[PDB]
């Protein structure tokens, strides 16, 4: 009945963390200890601290402190969580633990003070190499008295703090085969929900001439993932939304994933639809634009968007710098449709895994990181503020086109698409015929 911890996975991945840290590239340089603290998780935002726990343990743990030193690791948590972590702390006789620093478990006290435990972790940092600089996820600030008491104690030492979010994201980016199977299923579930529920519902609304608010349609998609018939064999208890589904139309667009569906009635023109399923903690992503009776001009821009995504897939391969992929795509726009340069999304996708969007792995003009086989990306491209020459009402005047898929980076060459939703005009057009 107790929660099972994948021990081999922990030993494998903690060794990988230490091998990258030891290499000392970028912000890993001169880091004496890595300090990760999780307080109460109000959620709302994905976080490196809890993502790291998912990667190492398979589960997130609130009010938990993790101190990785050169020659030892300390975890401090409640008695329940300590019992859980004993699965990896007690090596038993597992030779897979040979390469990993020994774990010390400290039991947190709701009452009776934790100063003795805090001091042990501080002394451990002090004794780790130079004992001066700690790697942190500076963005992660959690509420709670316990976290406040730990960070107050830690701050009295005046350690140098360096944010290691980017190097850690790169450390875990390449997916193991078991992780890829989870992301493949996540992508398949997203596709099933869209193919079997989302697209059908939109077509029913148009065919019936119904007035449905984007927010209501989004709620219906959320309700749909509670039903087994839409989950392609997966159990409803293993799936959640990566973010609330986003439907936009009628001239009111914003081609990103950090906004919610508005209260406006869906307009029957260009309907951008974004959704993603998180399966057993691994994210997927999909974006499709459904076009009602699209004109020649709309189809020409949309088919050019498909062409751009195809070029992106061809360039998204092992060893290539992310900014070089970005420039290759923008060069096609410059060469073929200069007038769309100021219309195209400034970002063309991002690394995706336990966390939905890796901020350090965004496909933009600046990113210097090199791609690797085994990385998984959400590849998204869109055109905003496009004009319908035949539009008469404001909601008909402007439209947008947005497409998005989950893809697996390969070596020599083109990336593999993991989502399975047809996107030719005949598959995404909502035609009078139906």
Curated annotation (Swiss-Prot):
Ubiquitous. Transmembrane segments: none annotated. The modification N6-acetyllysine is found at residues 139, 196, 223. It is found in: Nucleus; Chromosome. ADP-ribosylated. ADP-ribosylation by PARP1 is induced by genotoxic stress and correlates with dissociation of FACT from chromatin. The modification N-acetylalanine is found at residue 2. It comes from the Eukaryota. The modification Phosphoserine is found at residue 188. Changing residue 162 to V: In NEDDFAC; uncertain significance. Component of the FACT complex, a general chromatin factor that acts to reorganize nucleosomes. The FACT complex is involved in multiple processes that require DNA as a template such as mRNA elongation, DNA replication and DNA repair. During transcription elongation the FACT complex acts as a histone chaperone that both destabilizes and restores nucleosomal structure. Belongs to the peptidase M24 family. SPT16 subfamily. It is linked to Neurodevelopmental disorder with dysmorphic facies and thin corpus callosum: An autosomal dominant disorder characterized by global developmental delay, impaired intellectual development with poor or absent speech and language, and autistic-like behaviors. Corpus callosum anomalies are visible on brain imaging. Most patients have dysmorphic features including tall forehead, down-slanting palpebral fissures, ear anomalies and broad nasal bridge. Other variably present clinical features include seizures, sleeping difficulties and precocious puberty. Interacts with MYOG (via C-terminal region). Component of the FACT complex, a stable heterodimer of SSRP1 and SUPT16H. Also a component of a CK2-SPT16-SSRP1 complex which forms following UV irradiation, composed of SSRP1, SUPT16H, CSNK2A1, CSNK2A2 and CSNK2B. Interacts with NEK9. Binds to histone H2A-H2B. Identified in a centromere complex containing histones H2A, H2B and H4, and at least CENPA, CENPB, CENPC, CENPT, CENPN, HJURP, SUPT16H, SSRP1 and RSF1. Interacts with GTF2E2. (Microbial infection) Interacts with Herpes simplex virus 1 (HHV-1) protein ICP22; this interaction relocalizes the FACT complex to viral genomes in infected cells. The C-terminal Glu-rich acidic region is essential for FACT activity. This is FACT complex subunit SPT16. It comes from Homo sapiens. The lineage of its organism: Eukaryota, Metazoa, Chordata, Craniata, Vertebrata. The chain holds residues 1 to 434 of 1047 of the full protein.
């Amino acid at each position: 009945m107790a929660v099972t911890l994948d021990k081999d996975a922990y030993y494998r991945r903690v060794k990988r963390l230490y091998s990258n840290w030891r290499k000392g590239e970028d912000e890993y340089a001169n880091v004496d200890a890595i300090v990760v603290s999780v307080g109460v998780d109000e959620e709302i935002v994905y976080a490196k601290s809890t993502a790291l726990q998912t990667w190492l343990f398979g589960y997130e743990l609130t009010d938990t402190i993790m101190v990785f030193c050169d020659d030892k690791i300390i975890f401090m948590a409640s008695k329940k969580k300590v019992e859980f972590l004993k699965q990896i702390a007690n090596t038993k006789g597992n030779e897979n633990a040979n390469g990993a620093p020994a774990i010390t478990l400290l039991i947190r006290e709701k009452n009776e003070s934790n100063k003795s435990s805090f001091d042990k972790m501080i002394e451990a940092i002090k004794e780790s190499k130079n004992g001066k600089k700690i790697g942190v996820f500076s963005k992660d600030k959690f509420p709670g008295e316990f976290m406040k008491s730990w960070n107050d104690c830690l701050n009295k030492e005046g350690f140098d703090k360096i944010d290691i979010s980017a190097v850690v994201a790169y450390t875990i980016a390449v997916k193991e085969d078991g992780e890829l199977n989870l992301m493949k299923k996540a992508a398949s579930i997203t596709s099933e929900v869209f193919n079997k529920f989302f697209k059908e519902r939109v077509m029913e609304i148009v065919d019936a001439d119904e007035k449905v608010r984007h927010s209501k349609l989004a709620e219906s998609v959320e309700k749909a993932i509670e039903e087994k018939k839409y989950l392609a064999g997966a159990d409803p208890s293993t799936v959640e939304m990566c973010y609330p589904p986003i439907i936009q139309s009628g001239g009111n667009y914003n081609l990103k994933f950090s906004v919610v569906s508005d209260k406006n009635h869906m307009h029957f023109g260009a309907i951008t639809c974004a959704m993603g399923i998180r399966f057993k903690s691994y994210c997927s992503n999909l974006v499709r634009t459904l076009m009602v009776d699209p004109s020649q001009e709309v189809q020409e821009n949309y088919n050019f968007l498909l062409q751009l995504q195809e070029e992106l897939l061809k360039e998204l391969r092992h060893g290539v710098k992310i900014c070089d992929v970005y420039n290759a795509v923008m060069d096609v726009v410059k060469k073929q449709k200069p007038e769309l340069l100021n219309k195209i999304t400034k970002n063309l996708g991002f690394g995706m895994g336990i966390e939905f969007r890796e901020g350090s792995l965004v496909i933009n003009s600046k990113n210097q990181y090199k791609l690797k086989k085994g990385m998984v990306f959400s590849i998204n491209l869109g055109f905003s503020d496009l004009t319908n020459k035949e539009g008469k009402k404001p909601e008909e005047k402007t439209y947008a086109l947005f497409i998005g898929d989950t893809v697996l980076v390969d070596e020599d060459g083109p990336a593999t698409v993991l989502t399975s939703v047809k996107k030719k005009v005949k598959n995404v057009g909502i035609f009078l015929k139906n």
